[PDB]
Design a protein around this ligand. Structure first.
Ligand SMILES: C[C@@H](O)[C@@H]1O[C@@H](O)[C@H](O)[C@H]1O
Ligand SMILES: C[C@@H](O)[C@@H]1O[C@@H](O)[C@H](O)[C@H]1O
Ligand SMILES: C[C@@H](O)[C@@H]1O[C@@H](O)[C@H](O)[C@H]1O
Ligand SMILES: C[C@@H](O)[C@@H]1O[C@@H](O)[C@H](O)[C@H]1O
Ligand SMILES: [Zn+2]
Ligand SMILES: [Zn+2]
Ligand SMILES: [Zn+2]
Ligand SMILES: [Zn+2]
Ligand SMILES: [Zn+2]
Ligand SMILES: [Zn+2]
Ligand SMILES: [Zn+2]
Ligand SMILES: [Zn+2]
Ligand SMILES: [Zn+2]
Ligand SMILES: [Zn+2]
Ligand SMILES: [Zn+2]
Ligand SMILES: [Zn+2]
Ligand SMILES: [Zn+2]
Ligand SMILES: [Zn+2]
Ligand SMILES: [Zn+2]
Ligand SMILES: [Zn+2]
Ligand SMILES: [Zn+2]
Ligand SMILES: [Zn+2]
Ligand SMILES: [Zn+2]
Ligand SMILES: [Zn+2]
Ligand SMILES: [Zn+2]
Ligand SMILES: [Zn+2]
Ligand SMILES: [Zn+2]
Ligand SMILES: [Zn+2]
Ligand SMILES: [Zn+2]
Ligand SMILES: [Zn+2]
Lengths: 304, 304, 304, 304
């Protein structure tokens, strides 16, 4: 039977631990002998997992690139070993191809854009300036850059909206906590927080709590992911809006791995769907969430 | 309160009546004064419904064009009355600009492509020629033309697969029945039927039964829509593969109608998701179909 | 000075070589460093030409897509290199946004419609059925699909006219010849031939001659392009009707290449005019054809 | 043989006398018994010509509406007499239809837009304000309103450009002369003149001459039509840019009249092509102009 090697980022994230369960249990039903790597968020241990996959004679290799740059070498290596690659979740910035067989992930630019468009459509009648603080993702990672851009454009057509402060927090609760108290520190007027992942939004929520006033009413928070704790916080009113990012790639990852090993053809991009929730919708969405997320993913779409 | 005019094609198929239901009840519960016209499959009756919408001063107008061609005059008229137009499900082939504000529908080409690729993945080891028959949609309608193209491309890279017979059946059961009895006569070896809507496949299914062969095993059937009866046939083993086309535009149609009336900006295309089913998956998808469909639609995506 | 890359389809037809000439000499006289690739009718060779354009750092890239499908990856790549793209003559069916800056071509649907309506206006008093045979273009290319649709609609309101046989001939003389000898065998009564490019009509003309019937009077021919030899055949009475498709994009292609490179804004579609000819008009149009064609193109129109 | 009644505006214009020759001589070759009316630019004498056409038993009636409003009565009258109507050159603003069989004219909005886009692309680096004066067409006529709008949008994206003064001049030389000396009078800084027809541009040219400084260098003129004297003035350098409007409808008017009488079907809109000239291009365009214009019109396009 099939043997798949997967080189995962780390466990910075509730999304990432969800995603890791999806890959582990997905391999476990698909009948796939999975060999699984956690690079603790650092690129070179991921590349070493890759080389040890080539070095084991894996039939397929798949990973999610921590950040975009610096994979040419190891991708040409699997290139030459005869190892198909399947990209998951995050993109790589490479300039020679047939280095991999497909890329399955969300469209982060549009996640940012619909967060930005929510912000813009709330403050559509703000008489004066309305002040945005951005908790940014691990500098260099596909999602941080794309959500960066997309949210920028989403707020781009209401001139009252501008981002007063925005700096990186490594997609973490403690990161969001930390940068959120730095911005509590310097910025004196903060209306909305945009958290590139809702773990950082939860940390920032604690920082606002600690300063003594109320996430969800005084400072509004908008975040990306739709994690369990994200959604419970949104339902409780301490977030305002959350845009879904669907971590349950496991199963279509296994389908794709089988098709790429067997030499069946597979589409060049697979995009996972998203929706967004306000408070009420989140409180409706929680029941039987993992089932609903799996149906959501079965509704992915291809780019040909 | 808002008053919206909708000029529906007709009731040729279970998909169309599903969609008509979703629009009537969506207007009913978003609070919208709906004025609804049923053109009985005739373009000239749709156009005259539209003209009478203009003559009533409806605040938003929306329709689904029977065929791509011949709307120039009436769309310039709605432009010149100042009535925002929203397109639903089917495209128009127009030579004027900003004559409608957005278009919410499925990606018909990709539905055809995913059916054609199912045929290709089944007959990947076909010893000799494999004979496909195509039941085509209302000649002139967006979905028929696109589904033809996509299915053509999906089988396009397995030379054993060839479409020997292909003719229109007007998206109706009786049409598919009739064209299928003609195909049983003319073509002496029939391996697969590709039914552009699964209503025509149900007609063809009856024709196969009557002729003394067994649908789903002697002649395989692949179809588009995933209507109620489509899915029942698929679960009973009498179809082989169905690609979903999601009729429940009602609610997002109302969202868009409100914001274009209010002059809010809305994305220029809204694409409704799709999934495909084999027999087993068909039996699982049936249980809370209307709820699941509505969730699929809440996972749509924009083109901006 | 400016350097432009153009990836042409191939040389399947007199129209295509006409167009290739117009591009080479237009670049030569607008002062443009042209790098020109001939893909011999194969998509994968066009894509690789494009990738090598990126690898050369060309300032603008332009091509004409063999078929609508399968450019997602390479167009996102040109996007990500920052190379403006200009589409010429044939459309792409893409699921991404602003991946090209403008599209300059003819209106293929209307060419098909004007041929179909000529057939309809000729056989308006046909006593009984009138039998049409269609020679179809490269399955998958914009012009073939559109011309099919338009011709379908043009005959669509005279029930005597019916297309009994329709099959692809790859826009080549030998293709039309071959498919026409097949049509002479299978269909026993043939009144009209609709040749999606008049190269396939010249092939069919030879097939009619060889079979012992007289093109232009026994079997009538209607075709699209108005190539040199098309028009000669039309004037000799061996064709009956030709619709023009104007190959001389060279010069306006250079205009657009310069302004998109300079970052000037340019309209999103540029449509090249068409006219149709009977025998007499064919004999008049021949004399200063290249000059007249160039004037027709200077009368193009924009969609903004 | 056929009898056609045509109700022409008047003779305010070099374009209109050209157009009138086109209709008279076009009828004379097509074999059409034309009965021709000149309303001296005033609506009620045109409507009286119409009634006398109905009152004569004409087989077809065609006109060009001086201005958009006030034709409902007489169009319902020919409506009920059984007289097909063909619109030429100018549109009517009516709200009940099948009152006429087609409308053949130029797209005035785009004529204005490409004049505005020429202006905008010259003053692309103007360090400070650049000041536009508009000579407007007969208030109420399709072309005046549309060119109004189109030119507005063409200048719309260079903020240095604004129209300091713009008022009506009845599409006349004396009108342009008159309004041009009124604006010589009030506006103290005038860089460019936009003349909605180049007869008014010629009058304004004389007014500038008379004040003692130089059309074409100090005040630039841009006009619409491409009349004989317009083009000679542009070639002489006293205009800067002229956008073609093609008056030679005669022949396609006769084709359409025959098809509408015989009950053949005709497309619902016919759009006549345009190009624009700078000095050099005008000096190239003049030789054999009437022939070139006729070829231009044979390149019209339909809206279906
Ligand atoms: C979408 C993924 O790339 C992101 O990675 C995780 O660390 C974050 O929680 C997710 O948003
Ligand atoms: C996609 C829709 O336009 C189609 O219309 C109905 O007639 C068919 O069942 C659907 O597939
Ligand atoms: C319109 C063009 O794409 C077509 O390409 C050539 O192969 C044919 O002759 C033309 O009609
Ligand atoms: C286009 C026509 O409507 C206009 O009428 C004439 O008076 C002007 O010279 C033309 O521009
Ligand atoms: Zn949990
Ligand atoms: Zn979801
Ligand atoms: Zn696909
Ligand atoms: Zn898929
Ligand atoms: Zn109901
Ligand atoms: Zn139009
Ligand atoms: Zn057009
Ligand atoms: Zn047009
Ligand atoms: Zn479409
Ligand atoms: Zn049912
Ligand atoms: Zn579904
Ligand atoms: Zn969006
Ligand atoms: Zn939406
Ligand atoms: Zn040459
Ligand atoms: Zn894409
Ligand atoms: Zn899409
Ligand atoms: Zn997409
Ligand atoms: Zn097209
Ligand atoms: Zn030649
Ligand atoms: Zn021509
Ligand atoms: Zn333009
Ligand atoms: Zn142009
Ligand atoms: Zn003259
Ligand atoms: Zn011209
Ligand atoms: Zn036409
Ligand atoms: Zn015409």
């Amino acid at each position: 039977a099939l043997t798949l090697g997967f080189a995962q980022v780390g466990a910075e994230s509730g999304w990432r631990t969800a995603n890791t369960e999806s890959i582990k249990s997905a391999a476990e039903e698909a009948g796939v002998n999975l060999k699984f790597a956690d690079a603790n968020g650092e690129q070179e241990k991921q590349i070493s997992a890759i080389r040890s996959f080539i070095q084991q004679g894996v039939d397929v290799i798949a990973f999610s690139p921590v950040v975009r740059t610096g994979w040419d070498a190891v991708l040409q290596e699997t290139k030459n070993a005869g190892i198909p690659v399947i990209l998951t979740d995050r993109a790589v910035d490479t300039q020679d191809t047939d280095v991999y067989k497909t890329f399955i992930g969300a469209d982060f630019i549009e996640e940012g854009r619909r967060a930005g468009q929510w912000v813009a459509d709330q403050y559509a009648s703000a008489t004066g300036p309305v002040n945005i603080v951005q908790l940014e993702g691990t500098t260099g990672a596909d999602p941080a850059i794309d959500r960066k851009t997309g949210f920028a454009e989403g707020i781009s057509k209401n001139p009252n909206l501008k981002i007063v402060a925005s700096q990186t927090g490594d997609f973490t609760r403690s990161g969001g906590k930390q940068v959120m108290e730095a911005f509590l520190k310097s910025t004196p007027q903060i209306d909305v927080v945009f958290a590139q992942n809702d773990d950082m939004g939860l940390g920032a929520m604690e920082a606002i709590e600690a300063a003594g006033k109320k996430p969800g009413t005084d400072i509004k928070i908008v975040a990306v992911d739709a994690t369990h704790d994200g959604m419970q916080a949104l339902a409780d009113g301490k977030f305002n809006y959350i845009v879904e990012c669907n971590p349950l790639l496991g199963p279509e990852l296994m389908d794709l791995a089988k098709k790429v090993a067997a030499g069946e053809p597979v589409p060049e991009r697979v995009v996972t769907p998203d929706e967004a929730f306000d408070q009420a919708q989140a409180k409706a969405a929680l029941p039987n969430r993992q089932y609903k997320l799996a149906a959501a993913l079965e509704h992915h779409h291809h780019h040909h």
